[PDB]
């Protein structure tokens, strides 16, 4: 037991002077391009190491609002606002953010998959 105690003691670190520690400024990717699948695997492994946070809602009921006056009032305020421009702006900012993330991540962008994302239009229209 004395030998085990001395073994624990001799492995105790001693005082050391401070050192300048280098941290990666930007998560710079490597030369070789990566596909979406390998990127997903790597980023999921990275996310696994994070510490999740618990969220507790006040109740189970779905949030909603049945106040008529407020609803028609919001509708009137957004009435002069074309749906074409709104949807175009939303879709284009989504696309730009996706492409920017793909470019920064050195990941290949599959145009066909992004086009297939929004084919529910014709799926609804035909059926």
């Amino acid at each position: 037991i004395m030998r085990s105690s001395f073994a624990r003691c001799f492995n105790s670190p001693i005082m050391r002077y401070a050192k300048i520690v280098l941290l990666q400024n930007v998560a710079l990717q490597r030369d070789k391009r990566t596909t979406l699948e390998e990127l997903l695997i790597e980023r999921g492994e990275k996310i696994q190491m994070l510490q999740p946070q618990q969220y507790i809602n006040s109740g189970t009921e779905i949030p909603f609002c049945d106040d008529a006056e407020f609803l028609n009032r919001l509708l009137k305020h957004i009435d002069p606002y074309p749906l074409s421009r709104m949807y175009y702006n939303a879709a284009n900012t989504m696309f730009y953010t996706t492409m920017e993330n793909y470019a920064v991540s050195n990941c290949k962008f599959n145009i066909e998959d992004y086009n297939n994302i929004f084919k529910v239009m014709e799926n609804i229209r035909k059926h």
């Binding site: 401070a18 520690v21 280098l22 941290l23 990666q24 400024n25 710079l28 990717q29 175009y88 284009n92």
Partner: protein, 254 residues
């Protein structure tokens, strides 16, 4: 190359169209490559070494600073480094301040603890102070040249598929370049905002963010010390001696 996007709503045949130019995304991708930034920094260092070489300054920097008798080489080295940094900031002026004097310090009794290269006005001409023993102690310190700082798969796949510049010399070059970069930031505040602001900055480096970002952050290139985020090990514990129940309303430096 350009990429076009079309949005169509189910109330009509109207289609709103936007054109994206791929060059922006390519530039972001290139700026995201580790090899690209590594190449930029190494190319700056290589240009510095070439500039020293064409000035006969081929001898190792430690040997240059170890020669007490020959002051001309030390003065030329420091002046050339200052001029190189100035050109990096302003890529239009190839010649530094046309007239300036150098004084070499060999004593602790007249040494500044932490600013080896200092600048002053003798009412007639710029004067630059060089703390020779400090630079010698910097360059002569043994370097950690076997430890690894954090791709094995590409190496595995590959396995299945003349001036002698050592690492110590390159580290010495980078050390001197960073030191003269700090000195040049102090000198820039000096020249552009007066002796009073220069001596205010000597005791408080936090004014750099306000006196550089106004002009340098949008006109010049990136600074060498900005390549990595440097922090002091266990900084909070050591700083615990000086803790304030603070209320920061002008936190101009995060």
């Amino acid at each position: 190359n350009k990429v076009r996007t079309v949005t169509e709503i189910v109330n009509s045949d109207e289609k709103i169209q936007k054109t994206y130019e791929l060059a922006e995304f390519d530039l972001k991708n290139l700026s995201s490559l580790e090899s690209y930034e590594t190449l930029k920094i190494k190319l700056a260092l290589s240009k510095y070494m070439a500039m020293l070489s064409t000035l006969e300054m081929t001898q190792p920097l430690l040997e240059i600073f170890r020669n007490k008798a020959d002051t001309r080489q030390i003065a030329a080295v420091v002046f050339s480094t200052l001029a190189f940094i100035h050109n990096r900031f302003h890529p239009l002026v190839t010649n530094f301040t046309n007239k300036m004097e150098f004084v070499v310090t060999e004593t602790n009794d007249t040494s500044i603890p932490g600013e080896p290269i200092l600048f002053t006005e003798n009412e007639g001409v710029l004067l630059c102070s060089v703390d020779r023993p400090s630079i010698v102690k910097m360059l002569s310190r043994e370097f950690d040249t076997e430890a690894l700082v954090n791709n094995c798969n590409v190496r595995i796949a590959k396995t299945f598929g003349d001036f002698s510049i050592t690492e110590v010399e390159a580290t010495q070059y980078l050390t001197l370049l960073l030191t003269v970069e700090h000195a040049y930031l102090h000198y820039y505040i000096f020249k552009n905002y007066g002796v009073f602001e220069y001596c205010k900055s000597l005791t408080d480096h936090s004014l750099f963010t306000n006196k550089l970002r106004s002009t340098m952050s949008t006109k010049t290139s990136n600074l060498l010390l900005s390549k990595f985020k440097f922090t002091i090990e266990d900084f909070d514990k050591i700083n615990s001696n000086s803790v304030t129940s603070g209320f920061n309303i002008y936190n101009f430096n995060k």
